[PDB]
Design a protein around this ligand. Structure first.
Ligand SMILES: O=c1ccc2ccc(O)cc2o1
Length: 167
C-alpha cells in the first residue's frame, strides 16, 4: 500500500490522475518525483519551471552546481538530485524535445530511467512544451516502465482524452 490517492489504474503498474504535479508532490512527499528536464538542467518553464519555483529556486542552484561539475546530461538520460521540499529525490529525466528536432525514439530510453526506482510520481515525458504527442508518450510509458508510476496530467481536457483513448 502507498499514499497516492484518486488515481485511475491503467495497467498492473501505471496509474494516472488529473493533477498539478507540484501540488501532488507537496501532498504525498513521494520518494521520487520526476522532472521534465533539459540537458542543461535549466528549469525555465513547463513542469521544470513549476517544480523549481516551488523549491524557491533551490532546485536550480543545486542543478547549476551539478552541471558545473559533470557537464550536460544526454537526451534520454537522467540524474538523481535532491527533491527539496517536494520529495526525497528528484529524478531529472531528459525526454526528446520535438521543438528542437530530437529523435522521438529517444523517448523509450528516457522512460527506461524510471525502472531504476520502485515507485515514482511523474509527468508524461516529452509532453507539453517538449512538443510530443502525449497519447504516444503514455503508450511508450506503459510499454517501457515496469516499476510503479503515478502520472500527473496537468490539463483536465488532456487527461480525459488520454483515458478515453487508452488501449
Ligand atoms: O505554474 C505552473 C504550475 C504547475 C505546472 C505543471 C505542469 C506544467 O506543464 C506547467 C506548470 O506551470
Amino acid at each position: 500500500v502507498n499514499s497516492f490517492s484518486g488515481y485511475l489504474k491503467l495497467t498492473d503498474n501505471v496509474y494516472i490522475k488529473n493533477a498539478d504535479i507540484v501540488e501532488e508532490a507537496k501532498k504525498v512527499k513521494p520518494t521520487v518525483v520526476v522532472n521534465a528536464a533539459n540537458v542543461y538542467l535549466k528549469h525555465g518553464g513547463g513542469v521544470a519551471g513549476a517544480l523549481n519555483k516551488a523549491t524557491n529556486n533551490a532546485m536550480q542552484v543545486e542543478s547549476d552546481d551539478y552541471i558545473a561539475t559533470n557537464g550536460p546530461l544526454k537526451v534520454g538520460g537522467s540524474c538523481v538530485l535532491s527533491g527539496h521540499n517536494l520529495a526525497k529525490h528528484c529524478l531529472h529525466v531528459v525526454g526528446p524535445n520535438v521543438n528542437k528536432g530530437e529523435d522521438i525514439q529517444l523517448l523509450k530510453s528516457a522512460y527506461e530511467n524510471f525502472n531504476q526506482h520502485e515507485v515514482l510520481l511523474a509527468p508524461l515525458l516529452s509532453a507539453g512544451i517538449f512538443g510530443a504527442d502525449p497519447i504516444h508518450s503514455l503508450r511508450v510509458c506503459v510499454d517501457t516502465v515496469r516499476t510503479n508510476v503515478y502520472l500527473a496530467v496537468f490539463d483536465k481536457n488532456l487527461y480525459d482524452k488520454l483515458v478515453s483513448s487508452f488501449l
